[PDB]
Ligand binder design. Structure first.
Ligand SMILES: Nc1ncnc2c1ncn2[C@@H]1O[C@H](COP(=O)(O)OP(=O)(O)O)[C@@H](O)[C@H]1O
Ligand SMILES: Nc1ncnc2c1ncn2[C@@H]1O[C@H](COP(=O)(O)OP(=O)(O)O)[C@@H](O)[C@H]1O
Ligand code: SF4
Lengths: 259, 259
């Protein structure tokens, strides 16, 4: 009976979630964020449509993300991206305590307790370990970022990328091609390279029980598997992975719409 | 009467120096890293020719640089790049105490005392502040790395690049173009951006009196000027700037050839 709207406006995309009584997801949406493109707005329409409801049907609207204020007038209230991820993770996995969120342009590991963000470490300046790292690599390899996972899974040889930087690592990848190294192998290498950076931030926080991966890159099971190897613990993820930030907002909305 | 050979084999180029009695430069050479694995070799021939002498005439040969361990057989002893720069700087500027060396793929600030490396700070992992940063920018701007200095000198408006990263700053530059911002201005901005990183390392060491800029990027007076503004002290440089590492090797050679 009470419908709420969670809006996660990131730097790459804008995700939306609408849930009934804060217990079930009725609809979600995702729209690329282009300059001028007005995609966060579009995504809102997208959800409302998918759900067959009007903005006036939402009890409370909560926005989060990089441009969580670009639609200030839309959201009743805005909230930290760390908070929503913690809240959302908790809705999907009750025993979460550690949340690894990789999105374009940034990474962040969050320690969660009672759907809240206890502590966290995040990278906002280095393109390394971000989905942007994976883009720059998929381009040189001439492959689709959403294929990397599938390809790297075929690797038979370990190929390391000693360069920590995206720029230097780019040359490495180019050079590994000059040596006739297979792409499948270079990819699995790029994945461990990303895992390595995440693991780097990860340790300043500590991997607690029931680790979950969130964000768009979450889909890349190549990357996630590289993470399980590094941290040596199960890394969980679900289809809703990239809609976590939004899901968190919707949960905080339904909460604000009860107090 | 005693001729020595200094060979600085970098990642970008291979420089060579030959001096008589460790007091005067008789000849120098510079050869890129074209595909072949004989550019360092080629440069040696180049110098010997320019000088009109043969490898035998060289009393002692000392190699330095990224591929130092590659001239084992050609050279007689190898030495730290920090040491040669300090030694070489001292030969060019007696009162040096601080040496800023920007080359492709790395930056490093050296404190010098009696032709020796007292302390130093260096960047080897981040492409930011390196000549590689300038490359990635010259490409997007569609200009020649050796023109940047000349162009930026015409800027009339200050345009900042808030991004510290080469990858993110790359997009910025692209975006500053979308806003119709002049290249001349974007360049001067890129220069200060580089200066900022150098100054970053610089402070962990301390700018002492008589600062000198070394390395290929040394030529870029756009960059060097950005450095004088930041540190607020004179930054010296000479034509031999990029041959400093080699010059240092030749000086250590003539020294080894006297003890
Ligand atoms: N199928 C896929 N496989 C791999 N990566 C993907 C896939 N779909 C999206 N991604 C990526 O995951 C990231 C998700 O970004 P996201 O978290 O939505 O961005 P932001 O934090 O800016 O909102 C991007 O780098 C995007 O390209
Ligand atoms: N005329 C020039 N103007 C600006 N930059 C230059 C010029 N000539 C060379 N450079 C650059 O200066 C740097 C010199 O690199 P160098 O110190 O020789 O490399 P390495 O440290 O790998 O041996 C490179 O980034 C190169 O492109
Ligand atoms: S290490 Fe590379 S990817 Fe990271 S901030 Fe530096 S230039 Fe950017």
């Amino acid at each position: 009976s009470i419908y709420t709207l969670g809006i996660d406006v990131g730097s790459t995309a804008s995700k939306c979630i609408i849930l009934k009584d804060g217990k079930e997801i009725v609809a979600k949406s995702l729209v690329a964020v282009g300059t001028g493109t007005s995609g966060p707005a579009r995504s809102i329409s997208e959800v409302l449509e998918n759900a067959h409801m009007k903005k006036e049907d939402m009890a409370f609207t909560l926005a989060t993300g990089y441009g969580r204020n670009s639609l200030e007038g839309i959201a009743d209230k805005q909230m930290s991206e760390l908070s929503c991820h913690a809240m959302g993770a908790s809705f999907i996995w009750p025993n979460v305590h550690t949340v690894i969120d990789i999105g374009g342009q940034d990474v962040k590991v969050i320690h969660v307790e009672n759907g809240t963000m206890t502590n966290f470490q995040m990278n906002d300046k280095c393109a390394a370990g971000t989905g942007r790292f994976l883009d720059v690599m998929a381009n040189i390899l001439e492959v689709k970022v959403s294929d990397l996972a599938e390809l790297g899974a075929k690797s038979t040889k370990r190929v390391a990328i000693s360069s920590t930087c995206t720029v230097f690592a780019e040359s490495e990848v180019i050079s590994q091609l000059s040596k006739g190294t297979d792409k499948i192998d270079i990819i699995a290498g790029i994945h461990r390279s990303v895992a390595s950076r995440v693991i780097g931030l990860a340790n300043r926080v500590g991997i607690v029980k029931d680790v979950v991966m969130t964000g768009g890159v979450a889909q890349n099971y190549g990357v996630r598997g590289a993470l399980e190897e590094g941290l040596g613990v199960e890394i969980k993820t679900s289809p809703l992975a990239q809609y976590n930030g939004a899901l968190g907002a919707a949960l905080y909305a339904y909460k604000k719409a009860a107090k």
